[PDB]
Structure formats: C-alpha cells, structure tokens
Design a protein around this ligand. Sequence first.
Ligand SMILES: CCCCCc1ccc(-c2ccc(S(=O)(=O)CCO)cc2)cc1/C=C\c1ccccn1
Length: 229
Amino acid sequence: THRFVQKVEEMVQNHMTYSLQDVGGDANWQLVVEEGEMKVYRREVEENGIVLDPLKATHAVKGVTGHEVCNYFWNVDVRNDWETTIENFHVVETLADNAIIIYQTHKRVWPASQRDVLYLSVIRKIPALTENDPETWIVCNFSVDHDSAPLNNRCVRAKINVAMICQTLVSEISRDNILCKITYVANVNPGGWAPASVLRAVAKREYPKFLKRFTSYVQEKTAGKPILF
Ligand SMILES: CCCCCc1ccc(-c2ccc(S(=O)(=O)CCO)cc2)cc1/C=C\c1ccccn1
C-alpha cells in the first residue's frame, strides 16, 4: 500500500479491458510492419498538431514465459542490457517491491529537442478469472508527477502510458514447449513540438527494433535456466 495503489489498479484494469483485444479484424488499426509473429500497428492521431499515434504490437516468442518477459522488462538492473534509446535513468522512488517511479532521458533524435520522462513502473500478475482463461503478467509504465523530478533544460517532458501484457501457452515441461504471447501498447505524448515526420520515423524504426531486440534478449538470458512460470 503506497499512495498510487488505486491509480495503478485503474491503469492495469484499463489495459486488461482494452489493450488485450485482438485488432486483426479492426480496420481502425493500421498494420505498419509485420515480421513473422511480430505485428506492429498504429493509429494516426494528432493533437494540437503534435503526433500522438497510438502504437500497438503483438508478438509470439518461443521459449520464455510471460513472467520472465515481464521481469526482464521491469527489472531496472538489466535495463541497459537491452535499451538502446536511453541516455540516462534514475530511480526516483521505490513504492513497493513491484512498483517504482523512474526518471529517464532519451537520446536526442535530430533535429528535435531531447525528451525526458517521469513514470511509475509496476509489474502485476493477473490471475485467470476462470480455469479456461490464461493468467496474464503485465508491466505498466505511466507518467506521474513527482517533486524529485530533475530540472533538465535540454529536455521536453514526454508523457507515456505503456503496457507489456503477456500470456503464456504450454504445449518435464521444456522451453521447447512454451510460447509467450505479447501485446505491447505505447501511447506517447512527446510534448512540445517535434516534426511529425520525425516522430513517425522514430516510431516506425524504433518500436520493431525494440521488440525484436528485447524479446531476443529474454530468450538469450533465460535459455538453460529453469523455467520461471
Ligand atoms: C523527438 C523524439 C521524441 C521521443 C518520444 C518518446 C519518448 C519516450 C518513449 C518511451 C518509449 C517506451 C518506453 S517503455 O516501453 O516504457 C520502456 C522504458 O524505456 C518509455 C518511453 C518513446 C518515444 C517515441 C518513440 C520511441 C519508440 C521506441 C523507442 C524509443 N522511442
């Protein structure tokens, strides 16, 4: 029980309600890039001339569990092993053993000014409602206000609502028989102004690169370890 428990519950529930839905049949999502099981979609949205384009991706990763994927996504201690777009990050506050508030700066993308972010990051297990449903592991990263926020005059403050939502299929269980189904959503307000073409090019390049890189990292770090369901 920290002061964000209720907000966390709301953000997680919204993602469970809305973000998990399959968008194969939904023409409102534009499928931008497909590489195998990796499917990356966006909606073209601008507010006050700033690109907000919602990002939604699915993926199916052999050999790892949702629990493992989420631990690796969440655990700050391995962040620098997979992240390629971060210049700096600091843990601002520990709320609980499954929740922290993080400040980070993104590498500058010329010619836009650098962005920073301040967000609560929480990892949660959502039990299968019925014996028919999969359990879900989720990480949610969403912007919050904080006082120990750094002054950084080089940066415009972006605001994010990201979730990595994982269900695991199992087919001695070996990694050969496990598949992790990922839905990843990112809604990013870059703040300020940045050229629309730049924001779209960054999204189109960096999201598939992240998903490929990050998932491969989890496969590589877990191979030959006992499975953490
Ligand atoms: C001019 C450039 C503006 C950059 C806008 C931007 C700010 C923040 C973020 C962001 C993206 C993912 C997360 S997370 O998944 O929670 C993991 C922790 O880092 C947190 C923040 C994205 C983006 C915009 C594009 C973009 C896309 C994939 C990689 C990098 N940048």
